[PDB]
Amino acid sequence: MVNPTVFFDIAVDGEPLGRVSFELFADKVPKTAENFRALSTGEKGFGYKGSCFHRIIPGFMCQGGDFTRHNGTGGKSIYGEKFEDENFILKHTGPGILSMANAGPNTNGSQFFICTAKTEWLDGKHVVFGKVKEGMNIVEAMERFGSRNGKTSKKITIADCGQLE
Numbered sequence: 001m002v003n004p005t006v007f008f009d010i011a012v013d014g015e016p017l018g019r020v021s022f023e024l025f026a027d028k029v030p031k032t033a034e035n036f037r038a039l040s041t042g043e044k045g046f047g048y049k050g051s052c053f054h055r056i057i058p059g060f061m062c063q064g065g066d067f068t069r070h071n072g073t074g075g076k077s078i079y080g081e082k083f084e085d086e087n088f089i090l091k092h093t094g095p096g097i098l099s100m101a102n103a104g105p106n107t108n109g110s111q112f113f114i115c116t117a118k119t120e121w122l123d124g125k126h127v128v129f130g131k132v133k134e135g136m137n138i139v140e141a142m143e144r145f146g147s148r149n150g151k152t153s154k155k156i157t158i159a160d161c162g163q164l165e
C-alpha cells in the first residue's frame, strides 16, 4: 500500500554533503518505481551505489544513474538493457520531480534526473515516477556544482544509497 522511500547519501570530491530521500510513486508507476528502488538497494547485484551525477545544469535538472559508462551513454534496468515507457500519468510540475532519462520511445534503463525547475516540455516523453521527500537543500547544493553545458566542477557521487523504513 505505502509508496517506498529511498535515500542517496551525496558526496562532493569524496567529502560528505548530505542525504536526499525520494518517495517513489509505486501506486501509479509500479514497474518504473521498482526498477529505481532495486537499483538503489543493489539487491540484483548492480545499481547506483558509487555512481555519479554526470550532467548538472542549474535551473534545469541533475542527471545520474549511468553505472556502466559513467558519462550518460550507459546504464541498464532490472528488466534488461531497456524497458518500455510505463505510462505518462504524472507530469513535470516543478523542482524535486524524479523522472527517467531516455534515448527515444521505450528506452528506459537506469538513468534518471531530478528536476530543479518546472520542465513541462518533457511531459508525455519522460516517465515521472517519484519526488524528493527530504533534502531538496542538498539537491540545491549539488546544483551549484553544475554548469550551462552540464559538466560538473567537482565530482558529485552517490556515496551510499538504499531503502528507508
Ligand SMILES: CCCN(Cc1ccc(N)cc1)C(=O)NCC(=O)OCC
Pocket (backbone or CB within 6 Å): 061, 063, 072, 073, 074, 075, 100, 101, 102, 103, 104, 107, 108, 109, 110, 111, 113
Ligand atoms: C541520446 C541521448 C539520450 N540520453 C542519454 C541516455 C542514454 C541511455 C538511457 N537509457 C537514458 C538516457 C539523454 O540523456 N537524453 C536526454 C535526457 O534523457 O534528458 C533528460 C532530461
